[PDB]
UniProtKB/Swiss-Prot annotation, chain A:
This is Large ribosomal subunit protein bL17. Signal peptide: none annotated. Pfam families: Ribosomal_L17. Part of the 50S ribosomal subunit. Contacts protein L32.
UniProtKB/Swiss-Prot annotation, chain B:
The keyword Glycoprotein does not apply. InterPro entries: Ribosomal_bL34, Ribosomal_bL34_CS. Coiled coil: none annotated. GO terms for biological process: translation. Keywords: Ribonucleoprotein, Ribosomal protein. GO terms for cellular component: ribonucleoprotein complex; ribosome. It holds the Pfam family Ribosomal_L34. Gene3D superfamilies: 1.10.287.3980. It comes from Bacillus subtilis (strain 168). This is Large ribosomal subunit protein bL34.
Swiss-Prot record, chain C:
It comes from the Bacteria. This is Large ribosomal subunit protein uL22. The gene is rplV. PROSITE patterns: RIBOSOMAL_L22. Belongs to the universal ribosomal protein uL22 family.
Curated annotation (Swiss-Prot), chain D:
Disulfide bonds: none annotated. NCBIfam families: rpmF_bact. It comes from Bacillus subtilis (strain 168). One of its GO terms (cellular component) is large ribosomal subunit. It holds the Pfam family Ribosomal_L32p. Part of the 50S ribosomal subunit. InterPro entries: Ribosomal_bL32 (IPR002677), Ribosomal_bL32_bact (IPR044957), Ribosomal_zn-bd (IPR011332). Belongs to the bacterial ribosomal protein bL32 family. GO terms for molecular function: structural constituent of ribosome. GO terms for biological process: translation. Keywords: Ribonucleoprotein, Ribosomal protein. This is Large ribosomal subunit protein bL32.
Length: 119, 44, 109, 54
RNA sequence: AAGAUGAUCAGGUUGAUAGGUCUGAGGUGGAAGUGUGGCGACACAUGGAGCUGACAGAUACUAAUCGAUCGAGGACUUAAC
RNA sequence: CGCGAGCUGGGUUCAGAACGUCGUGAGACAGUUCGGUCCCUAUCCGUCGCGGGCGCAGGAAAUUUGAGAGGAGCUGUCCUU
RNA sequence: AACAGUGGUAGGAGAGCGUUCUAAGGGCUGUGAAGCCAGACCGGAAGGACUGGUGGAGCGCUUAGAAGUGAGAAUGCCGGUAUGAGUAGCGAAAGAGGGGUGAGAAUCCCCUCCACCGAAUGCCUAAGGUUUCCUGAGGAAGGCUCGUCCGCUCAGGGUUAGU
RNA sequence: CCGAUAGUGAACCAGUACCGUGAGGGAAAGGUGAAAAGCACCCCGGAAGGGGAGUGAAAGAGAUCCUGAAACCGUGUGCCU
RNA sequence: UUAAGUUAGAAAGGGCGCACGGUGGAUGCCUUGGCACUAGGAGCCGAUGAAGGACGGGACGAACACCGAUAUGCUUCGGGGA
């Protein structure tokens, strides 16, 4: 199933479209736990479009990646970073692009933080 | 909704203020019981 | 045997009996590790008292501090603050800001 | 619904039975310790089989 | 498949438990882009094309690491052995 | 005249308002009519589901037996005879 | 000493015990008074005493007298603490990610994405408020949770009119 | 006569604080020690808060600071479940 | 070894007894104050501006108490003697 995450069906899209972009810039995020486990199901679809590289394939991926400059001084968008960097690295790999490592809970709410890293 | 101390600098000081209670002889008994008791805030 | 006393740090007692009942009987190598990970955020109030109780037994008596058995761990409701919290329809109920007294008597095996 | 009669000092303590919290599943890091909890990365060194991921 | 949490049940690297990735099933129903007809709005071809949430079958590619805790030594009277 | 800490107020019987009648008048009427804040976080016993201990003369895993407990318990046509 | 009696509300009578103060002396206290807590002691009761421990300066006895003379019940009064109960509630309304600060960060700061009002949730200025404004430190308390933060605390600074 | 729930409402910066538009209502709050000798110094802690050290007769006397009861809230328990 | 059997203990937690504690301020004493009175004195201040108050004054900003732009005070006459 999917996860409701306490957000409205439009709030989840703005939720997930941010976090998938932030894996492109940061290479790793410390979300909460079910914000981690529910993020890997989208990015491993989104990196799958990276390996294609069609003019049709990029225009599917722009609906989950926003307009944010990723590397300074090269002026790359996060859309550009998938097809230039990430796809050139995962031509060996078939699935399982982002491993998830659990960290301990958080102080102010007891929420289980979790670390996502791509791999 | 609306409550009863709609605050006024003027209307508070004219109805209840000092010279209004040095005005009438019954009004000065208010300034006698405010003195034999010995309050600090004489008439508001 | 050693003793540390907390004396009036604001937490409820019943929110600190529960942190306490994974300590009474344990060891120093078996409680400082456990209190860091409960998470139960009245823990580092107590963990700054147990670790201060050990460094009482470090300096003041030198009781071979890594070999200690935690013996007494009672917590009593200290001087209670009391505040009025307002409420609708003119009720104005009360909020009892509790306070506790943590005592962790640390002793030799 | 208003509680008809106060709970005595026995019944008050008898609901504290299952009210106790429990231990965390804890083991040591084979890098440092001491200790870690189960299956989650320590705050101690941050290694986790065994990459030094801070 | 179960479910408020506990519980049950499938499972923990002689592993398919879940996610991904493929091949599908069903669903939507002709993608972008390109060329052509049309002044044009649009149509036509590439082409049952494109897109797919839990649905199926493969794949260790990811996460199920480490490890810890609990748990017996079987009373004695009699009857038969 | 089961059932408002499960619900609805349509009438009776709150104040407003009329009509007939009565009284000198305020008002009155089991004579009629239009409108008229239905509050409660479930303590205990109950009920209905889920768990944690413990016991079952050693600890364990499966399948059970059934003392006992419930559920089900309705029938109409039509054709032949 | 013999004989008989000896339930009891409303009520009548009688006898007592208590507490505080005064009056006679007589008598305990730093070698520990009152009060407190304990204890298996004594009289018919109200009640007394003794040993221990705490307590650190007053106190009982007898004999009379005075009385703000005795507590379980006033939906009494005040104060404290429970119960419910770790329960209802946490006051409409999107944040997320990186860095920084610090002992500690989801709630503090900065940046970048995103989102809401936009005939108001914009500005300007009355009614009022009287420093809530700015800076620099803190952070116990008020913030319905934290909190390095604040309209909180401190210490300074802050309002210039012939129109 | 009272000895701080008494005695004036006020032994305490009281007709104060608060409550009211306003006339008005109107509290609570005594005691370190013989004197500050009011805890230099070390250890934990960010800091309160403690443990040693000294101060004094006492520090369990250390800021509601003499006495400290009970409701309550604990922790150990000897015997019962 | 099996059968047929009688009873102990276990305590997640709780009951009572005791020991040591903590919030709580109450009985003790102790008054800084009050309450009743006695014997005496005083029984009136104010346009030469009163009773009562605001603004203020200190090397120290708040407040109490004293005081008034001579402002935490000024003369003078007495008491007083570190």
């Amino acid at each position: 199933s999917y996860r409701k995450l306490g957000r409205t069906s439009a709030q989840r899209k703005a939720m997930l479209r941010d976090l998938t972009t932030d894996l492109i810039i940061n290479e790793r995020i410390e979300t909460t736990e079910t914000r981690a486990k529910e993020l890997r199901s989208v990015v491993e679809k989104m990196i799958t479009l990276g390996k294609r590289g069609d003019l049709h394939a990029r225009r599917q991926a722009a609906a989950y990646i926003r307009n944010e400059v990723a590397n300074e001084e090269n002026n790359q968008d996060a859309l550009q970073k998938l097809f230039s960097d990430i796809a050139t690295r995962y031509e060996e790999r078939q699935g399982g692009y982002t491993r998830i490592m659990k960290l301990g809970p958080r102080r102010g709410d007891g929420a289980p933080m979790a670390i996502i890293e791509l791999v | 909704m609306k409550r009863t101390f709609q605050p006024n600098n003027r209307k508070r000081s004219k109805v209840h203020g000092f010279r209004s209670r040095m005005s009438s002889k019954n009004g000065r008994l208010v300034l006698a019981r405010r003195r034999r008791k010995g309050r600090k805030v004489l008439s508001a | 045997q050693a003793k540390a006393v907390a004396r009036t740090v604001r937490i409820a007692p019943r929110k600190a009996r529960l942190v306490m009942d994974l300590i009474r009987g344990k060891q120093v190598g078996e409680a400082v590790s456990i209190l860091n990970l409960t998470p139960r955020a009245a823990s580092p109030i107590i963990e700054k008292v147990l670790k201060s109780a050990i460094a009482n037994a470090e300096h003041n008596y030198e009781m071979d501090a890594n070999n200690l058995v935690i013996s007494q761990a009672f917590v009593d409701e200290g001087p209670t603050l009391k505040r009025f919290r307002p409420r609708a329809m003119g009720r104005a109920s009360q909020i009892n800001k509790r306070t506790s007294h943590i005592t962790i008597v640390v002793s030799e095996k | 619904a208003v509680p008809f009669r106060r709970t005595s000092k026995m019944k008050k303590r008898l609901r504290r039975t299952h009210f106790k919290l429990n231990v965390p599943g804890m083991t040591e890091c084979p890098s440092c310790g001491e200790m870690k909890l189960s299956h989650r990365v320590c705050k101690a060194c941050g290694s986790y089989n065994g990459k030094d991921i801070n």
